[PDB]
Design a protein. Sequence first.
Lengths: 58, 65
Amino acid sequence: QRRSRTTFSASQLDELERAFERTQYPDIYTREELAQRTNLTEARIQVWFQNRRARLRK
Amino acid sequence: KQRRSRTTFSASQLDELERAFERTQYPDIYTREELAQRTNLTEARIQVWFQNRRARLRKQHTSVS
DNA sequence: AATAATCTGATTAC
DNA sequence: TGTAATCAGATTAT
């Protein structure tokens, strides 16, 4: 059993897309700042970027 | 580029983690979350620990074979 | 130099 | 769906 899929809101997604434009590989401080800003865990942020790098590469 | 500092597990947390690994190498979300409570580690660190644990297991086996 | 953290590439599951 | 979650495998780097 997997954790239940997070459903990112559009305001959350906008914050993450803007950060992605600054860097596709944010460091720990940047990922934690974002998590705090979006009420998400650094882990979900890390996974969003991982998947967002995938799609872009694909 | 800064990464998260290495987390250091206590002998107590390490014992709890390995005994869980012995019961199960692919702990579901509930298990990992339970483990997190017991040990006081975040579940994110637990998932990473199991990942690295399964990899130590695989490397040892290939090595000795 | 052992292993926590990060990445990609495939894949699952919803 | 498209995409969030997971995994193995490889690697970085404390």
